[PDB]
């Protein structure tokens, strides 16, 4: 039971971190959750187990994002697992969460690394959305997990932030596009998300603590439900006040 | 009831977004102080409505924008809370009350300006300042702003100015109350059907609907439900922010 | 230069700091400038003298802002001064620069001080714009000096930030309002700026203010003045309703 | 002229905004590298116009968004720079080159996507990376973004994604390059008449004109004159920002 009973959801990159927590949370609201990961079937199944242990419903879906054919593989697996469990291909909630980072100075960024950041973080989300319009009913949900680094300068992750900048444009423009179909499209921006180095990252928030994976997941689940029907095209700041300069 | 055994004050609460906000917060198990400037009866009609759902609420009278406004309000509030809970703890503060100008820029007088500032910006500042002594660590402050802070409309410039002032309150009090774990956030409504004579008129309603990407006017419920979320535990990691409850009016 | 030759301007709070430098840069570009100040007639005459030494044109205007009759006196003096030197009351450029800070913790703010900050920082600029519309021609300019404190949290000056967030709303709605008359309306947001005070004589404090800028220096009054001058000229005809970040990258974090 | 003694590269300066930017920078006395993909005559026409007005410019030819683009661009750039100044100093970099998608969201192919990224966001990044050694302390990077980063338009979502990436390039390199005194800023045009067929129909024009509060479309000089200000000394204290050169298109 819960807000999302009889709803289906897909969360990309949800074997670890925010994705995992988001899947758990959405499942807790009574949603059927496709747990996606790129490479680890094991981690993906740990998540599916937890959801079942806590009385919810989920299934793992493996498909490496960032490579030719990623969208085919994601949906082939996804659409089957859905018809298997509901006899429909409907996808009520899409969470674009998967993302990889750069971790080098701009002078060390290769054309190839740039291509891959774009491919996983921005290109996949675009073509995942495009194909998912097929499955998403009227009144459905799209939620894109952004990054605090889009509002906060960090040259050590410039290529990463560029791709998340790109992802945030999905929110603005698909919100407009999907208006007539009553599908809301929003972004969620985390802060820093989980020694003496702990003490310094905790300083960035006004709450003097580091973010937890739950801190973001709870905002996603709100966006995923009916209480958020009148919010679209917007950016939700789940960073514990990190943007306040 | 996720807000059970919590207390809430919503200013300008006898009608419109305020009404719906009180009703929603009550429905979540919170005892709600329903504030009004003038009509004791209208504020009691809301209290009535809440109790018929198995909720807890009490009316409060205090004309905002005049000398001693804050005093009268917190006098009645502290009284009503003690009588009902043996404490005067205020978990949730919603600054909802506000008035518009409805004249062109060249037609604004000093008296109107002063009046807009007094009700829309001054009162909320001092209601926050006073409420600090009643809000526990982990409490909630929600300021109802306006989409006109992001969408040009000269016909309400002075009103928007007072609301932009309100949002700055949000920014700075959020930083100030971080160590006490109180979130401070603004909710910006779009065009919302309250009950004014413009909404009696279709074609006018048709015009306003088009501002939203969903092709409808907002309902009071649309905004109250966003307020309710910020009031709850799911929004503990959101502070100092502006939530866009306009149905995508800001998209251009 | 002669870019603003034939133009007139008013810069409020123009005897000191950012206001002063703005008045100076406008005059340099060829504008006849009304230097306003609230009380100090001498400091205003000093700016005028400086502008004249450089071969420009300026006059002083006394009018205390934030008290009853402030707009009235300002424009009485403005109009007399403009008519004498040009034969017209045409006001091409209006710069809303004047403002006062609160300098008090959010708990010590009284209803009086709040009124005072509003009256000076929000009320006056609104009514100055309102009254100035009668003098500003099609093609004219309005620049509002805001604050980086609208973008950067600082509870120490919260009431002041509210008045300045009010001021940004002026920019947004009047830009829309004044579109059909081809007047641009923009905001300029300073960061920390060295206004000549003793505070800036201490290097240890200078350094910790400098760190807020990506360039590792404090701003000069001239860094802000030069942006205002750009907005005020023809090259910025296609910018309106916007906010210019003249703070040396303070908002980057 | 403010830019006497300085050099500038403007990518895609053979027509539209790039062309006018090149022309305006040369007018202030800068030596301008005029760039485009293959059309030598197109680049040279801009060079001709600049020379008539008594300025200095040379054409440089490199198709952006293909393996080797950067190498080919800088080889041509330095050659031409050395032939004229006997130095490879680049004072001013303007990332203007850009292409549009122009198909519905459902129609976008991986191929089109890759192409927009490669030209609009990736090339600017690697051009910057490579230019860093030629740009002296106190120099300038100006990135030509788009109002579509703030104004919803599904017909160009992929394009707008690349411009969102572009604005991130501004934010992060502004920080990275601060200790070197290099300002990095975005200029975001609205609808600007660039000679394409759409600006010929006086009906679609009137419609486009209505996006601005001045009720006209932008001209190429409207944007170029903003770039020129950023390229000069008067804008030394602005960095990491977005300049809204749309004539008030983002006001709602
Ligand atoms: N005009 C508008 O409405 C508008 C609005 C917002 C933003 N913008 C932005 O402003 C910039 C220029 O706009 P515009 O309207 O002036 O464009 P334009 O008239 O189409 O000219 C663009 C220039 O970019 C060059 N270019 C395109 N692809 C290239 C490639 N792969 N390699 C090398 N050069 C390339 C073109 O040269 P070749 O022909 O040789 O390729 C051309 O000189 C773009 O970044 C655009 O996104 C324009
Ligand atoms: C010139 C054009 O063929 C027409 C067009 O559709 C457009 C194009 C490029 C743009 O950057 C924009 C726009 C735009 O409308 C438009 C409409 C409203 C706001 C905008 O920022 C824009 C644009 O930025 C391609």
Structural notes for this entry:
Chains B, D: Belongs to the short-chain dehydrogenases/reductases (SDR) family. Chains B, D: NADP(+) binds at residues 12, 14-15, 17, 37, 63-64, 96, 98, 115, 163, 192, 194. Chains B, D: Residues 6-190 form the Ketoreductase domain. Chains B, D: It comes from Streptomyces fradiae. Chains B, D: This is Oxygenase-reductase. 4 copies of one chain form a homotetramer. With 245 residues, the first copy, chain A, is an alpha/beta fold. The first copy, chain A, has one domain: Rossmann fold, CATH 3.40.50.720. Chain A is 42% helix and 16% strand. Chain A contains 7 helices and 7 strands. Chain A has helices at residues 17-28, 41-53, 70-86, 111-132, 158-177, 197-203, 213-224, and strands at 7-11, 31-37, 57-62, 93-96, 141-145, 184-190, 235-238. Chain A has a 7-stranded parallel beta sheet with strand order 3-2-1-4-5-6-7, with helices on both faces. In chain A, helix 1 links the parallel strand 1 and strand 2. In chain A, helix 1 (17-28) runs parallel beside helix 2, helix 1 (17-28) crosses helix 7 (213-224) and helix 4 (111-132) packs parallel to helix 5 (158-177). The longest helix of chain A is centred in the middle third of the chain and has 22 residues, at 111-132. The termini of chain A are far apart. The relative contact order of chain A is 0.14. Chains in contact: A-B, A-C, A-D, B-C, B-D, C-D. The interface between A and D is large, with 37 and 40 residues. Bound molecules: NADP nicotinamide-adenine-dinucleotide phosphate and rabelomycin. NADP nicotinamide-adenine-dinucleotide phosphate is lined by residues 12, 14-18, 36-39, 63-65, 96-99, 119, 144, 146-147, 189, 191-192, 194 of chain D.
């Amino acid at each position: 039971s819960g807000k999302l009973t009889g709803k289906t959801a897909l969360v990309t990159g949800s074997s670890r971190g925010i994705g995992r927590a988001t899947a758990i949370r959405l499942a807790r609201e009574g949603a059927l959750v496709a747990v996606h990961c790129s490479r680890n079937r094991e981690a993906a199944d740990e998540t599916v187990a937890t959801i079942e242990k806590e009385g919810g419903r989920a299934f793992s879906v493996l498909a490496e994002l960032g490579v030719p054919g990623d969208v085919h593989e994601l949906f082939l697996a996804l659409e089957r697992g859905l018809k298997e469990r509901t006899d429909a291909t409907t996808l009520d909630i899409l969470v674009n969460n998967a993302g990889v980072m750069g971790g080098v100075a701009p002078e060390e960024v290769t054309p190839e690394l740039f291509d891959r950041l774009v491919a996983v973080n921005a290109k996949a989300p675009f073509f995942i959305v495009q194909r998912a319009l097929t499955l998403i009913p009227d009144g459905g949900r799209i939620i894109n997990i952004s990054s605090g680094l889009t509002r906060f300068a960090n040259p050590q992750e410039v290529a990463y932030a560029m791709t998340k900048g790109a992802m945030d444009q999905l929110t603005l423009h698909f919100a407009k596009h999907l208006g007539s179909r009553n599908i809301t499209v929003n972004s969620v921006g985390p802060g820093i998300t989980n020694p003496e180095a702990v003490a310094q990252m905790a300083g960035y928030s006004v709450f003097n603590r580091v973010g937890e994976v739950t801190d973001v997941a709870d905002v996603v689940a709100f966006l995923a439900g009916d209480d958020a029907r009148w919010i679209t095209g917007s950016y939700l700041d789940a960073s514990g006040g990190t943007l306040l300069g």
